Design a protein around this ligand. Structure first.
Ligand SMILES: [Ca+2]
Ligand SMILES: [Ca+2]
Ligand SMILES: [Ca+2]
Ligand SMILES: [Ca+2]
Ligand SMILES: [Zn+2]
Length: 316
């Protein structure tokens, strides 16, 4: 909508207070005009028709419990935009400042979030398995990164390509979490998963096997569930990325960490320059080695660490 840019205040899913960019025109709308062509947040009103209604508020104050998932979806989309712009010189997910749209309150008791090719969609969870999914910055950044992947490498959501697609989203989701410095860790979804249980999460990058995902290529899932294991076998790639950044010894193979910043740069380059829709794990290794080579030289520590990490998880 056309109107006056302003700033509202609200409370997120976890009860934290934050400022959000809104737009005033009779009502205050969740429309942020300060980033690209805008960030727009919609109310799906417990239905499955999308996008729903552009979120309208009478007084520019968002403290109702019904408001919380909208506040965080809007706010964390902003933070994710800033990350990609400031760190990777990328303007929105298409590189041309495309408007970012999110709907919250999707369906009833819906325990998921997703990018549907056009926008983000967040369920409220059932209150037991999940609380509203936009309360997790790593969740929001994970989803938005699917959009980036869609417009760049175009990794098919299936088998090894899909696993890479999933891992890329976990990696950048985590990097965004570190960027905003909000209780950062190498776990996925811990802020909104199982409010009854402390210390757990949906997936772990540092130790995928903690929740039954493979941390080695020999333990890959070869069946047909989950589109050929795209959320399962991502563990293999997630562990490799964890090792590149932090280092460690894994199945007897030692890896010197080179840190988060370089991890981001290497994988961003691989994603945007070298990966293709049908890339498999072995091609990912080659892309990553080549990207580090481009950035730091063929005899750098960086190239060496990327090699050791993939060696460690059994990807040749
Ligand atoms: Ca209000
Ligand atoms: Ca965290
Ligand atoms: Ca996390
Ligand atoms: Ca939990
Ligand atoms: Zn995903």
């Amino acid at each position: 909508i056309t109107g006056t840019s302003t700033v509202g205040v609200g409370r997120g899913v976890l009860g934290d207070q934050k400022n959000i960019n809104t737009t005033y025109s009779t009502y205050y709308y969740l429309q942020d005009n300060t980033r690209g062509n805008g960030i727009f947040t919609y109310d799906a009103k417990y239905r499955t028709t999308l996008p729903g209604s552009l979120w309208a508020d009478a007084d520019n104050q968002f403290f109702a419990s019904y408001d919380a998932p909208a506040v965080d979806a809007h706010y964390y989309a902003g933070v994710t935009y800033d990350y990609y712009k400031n760190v990777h010189n990328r303007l929105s997910y298409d590189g041309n400042n495309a408007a970012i749209r999110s709907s919250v309150h999707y369906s009833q008791g819906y325990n998921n979030a997703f990018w549907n090719g056009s926008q983000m969609v967040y369920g409220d969870g059932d209150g037991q398995t999940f609380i509203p999914l936009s309360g997790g910055i790593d969740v929001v950044a994970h989803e938005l990164t699917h959009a980036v992947t869609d417009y760049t490498a175009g990794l098919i959501y299936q088998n090894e390509s899909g696993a890479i697609n999933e891992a890329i989203s976990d990696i950048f989701g985590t990097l965004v979490e570190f960027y905003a410095n909000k209780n950062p860790d190498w776990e996925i979804g811990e802020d909104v998963y199982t409010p009854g249980i402390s210390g757990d999460s949906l997936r772990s990058m540092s130790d995928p096997a903690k929740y039954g995902d493979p941390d080695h290529y020999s333990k890959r899932y070869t069946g047909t569930q989950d589109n050929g294991g795209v959320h399962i076998n991502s563990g293999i790639i997630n562990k490799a990325a964890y090792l590149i950044s932090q280092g460690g010894t894994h199945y007897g193979v030692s890896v010197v960490g080179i840190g988060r910043d370089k991890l981001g740069k290497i994988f961003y380059r691989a994603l945007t320059q070298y990966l293709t829709p049908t890339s498999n794990f072995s091609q990912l290794r080659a892309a990553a080695v080549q990207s580090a080579t481009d950035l730091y030289g063929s005899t750098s520590q960086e190239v060496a660490s990327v090699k050791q990490a993939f060696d460690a998880v059994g990807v040749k």
